Amino acid sequence: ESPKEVLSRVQDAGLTLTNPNDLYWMVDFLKEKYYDNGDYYYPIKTVCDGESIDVKFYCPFEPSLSPHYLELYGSRDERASIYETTMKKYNRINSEKTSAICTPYSSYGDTQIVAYFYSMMYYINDQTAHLKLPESEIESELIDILNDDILIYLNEFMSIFEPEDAQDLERIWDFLDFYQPYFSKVDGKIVLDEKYLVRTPSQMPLIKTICEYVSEQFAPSKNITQVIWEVVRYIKGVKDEIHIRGDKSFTLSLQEYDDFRDKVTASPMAHAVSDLTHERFSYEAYTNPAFMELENRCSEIITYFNDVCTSDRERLDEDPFNSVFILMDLDPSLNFAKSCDVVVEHAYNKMQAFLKLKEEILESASDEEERLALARMIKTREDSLIGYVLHEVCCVEDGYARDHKPLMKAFLEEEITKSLAEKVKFNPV
Ligand SMILES: CC(C)=CCC/C(C)=C/CSP(=O)(O)OP(=O)(O)O
Ligand SMILES: [Mg+2]
Ligand SMILES: [Mn+2]
């Protein structure tokens, strides 16, 4: 469309998330107003316990939206039929918007597989959210189902894992930890004992769709051990969350919260698959201690941004898994607004630590092939950082985001109207 057509639509109907064209103009505006002016502080306007939350998320990476978002959104109904879900739940998760904005320069299939991985985390997280309820309402059968589901999900990723190097087989085997007694090494493959294939989990078609794509697109030609490794780390992290939530006694420090969030942010899974889509790729980076820390910083940055945006909803859930609430429990002088400011500052320092590790990792490269591979893999994680910022910024329609921000809807509609009008006036210059 032309800027004149969109300006007329915005002046009449405002900004929506149901018209997928609006998101292209929102991301384009955010790049022009902020990134293109050297301003890397993107506004977040929400509320928590009636307090005004008006902060800026620092991220100096180029904003972009996937060209496949139109087709991804146009096929959202057939994509949702894979899931056991209501459309209200599927619309709030909005994996089409998440993947398109965090994986902006990939093929249609390589973008959709990222949407599948993020949707897997959201549906498993919502199943784990039953433990948020007070103990008077927790059903043991649902916990039994959850514990059995993640073990069956884990085995389905094991069924597509047949590494060419026996050392990679031992890497996953030793990483199973408390899940190892359930599995056995049978002819170069890790197999769950058939005694434990008890049920068909509710989201098994989703997990089978993921494993089918990974085994058909990357397994014949690439080493998919890290994709399996990050899935094991995530599934183990979910088990740790079940243990903590099931105990109903949250005593995690901010450092322990970071260590836990390093496992369950799920973005390392999407990065592992996205790394296999580029020729510039170094599997040895996954065991580099500096690269592992860079991935941990990325997960914590996304966590802290999420903690600010989801604070009010999780406050009503009485969910203690939030750095805003952990800091308030430690410091009684902090309200929700002052605590969010501290979290935003922590996210800035983690971003500087991310950029410092980046410079050290690229300098430690042995040859040009390794340098270009490391730079490509770090760029993939930078795409997710700016992508998640804009993801929360562009929550402008209620029901199509986990945390609708009506103040951002008003702010973006007012600001994009002035920007589009300036485009129409100076046209065609
Ligand atoms: C969306 C992307 C790019 C990565 C994952 C970020 C993310 C929202 C992780 C889960 S945070 P968690 O508190 O577990 O979940 P919510 O209640 O905020 O939905
Ligand atoms: Mg949380
Ligand atoms: Mn959250």
Curated annotation (Swiss-Prot):
Can also use Mn(2+) ions as cofactors with a lower efficiency. It catalyses: (2E)-geranyl diphosphate + L-glutamate = N-geranyl-L-glutamate + diphosphate. One of its GO terms (molecular function) is transferase activity. Mg(2+) 2 binds at residues 314, 321. Mg(2+) 1 binds at residues 306, 310, 314. Its EC number is 2.5.1.-. Pathway: Secondary metabolite biosynthesis. Changing residue 98 to M: Acquired activity on dimethylallyl diphosphate (DMAPP), but reduced efficiency with geranyl diphosphate (GPP) as substrate. InterPro entries: Isoprenoid_synthase_dom_sf (IPR008949). It comes from the Eukaryota. Induction: Up-regulated under phosphate limitation and by increasing partial pressure of CO(2). GO terms for biological process: cellular response to carbon dioxide; cellular response to phosphate starvation. Changing residue 391 to A: Reduced efficiency with L-glutamic acid (L-Glu) as substrate due to a reduced affinity. Keywords: Magnesium, Metal-binding, Transferase. Its cofactor is Mg(2+). Disulfide bonds: none annotated. Changing residue 314 to A: Complete loss of activity. Belongs to the terpene synthase family. Magnesium-dependent glutamate N-prenyltransferase: part of the gene cluster that mediates the biosynthesis of domoic acid (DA) and derivatives, natural products with neurochemical activity acting as ionotropic glutamate receptor (iGluR) agonists, thus being neurotoxins causing amnesic shellfish poisoning (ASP). Catalyzes the conversion of L-glutamic acid (L-Glu) to N-geranyl-L-glutamic acid (NGG) in the presence of geranyl diphosphate (GPP). Also able to catalyze the formation of farnesyl-L-glutamate from farnesyl diphosphate (FPP). Cannot use dimethylallyl diphosphate (DMAPP) as substrate. This is Magnesium-dependent glutamate N-prenyltransferase. It comes from Pseudo-nitzschia multiseries.
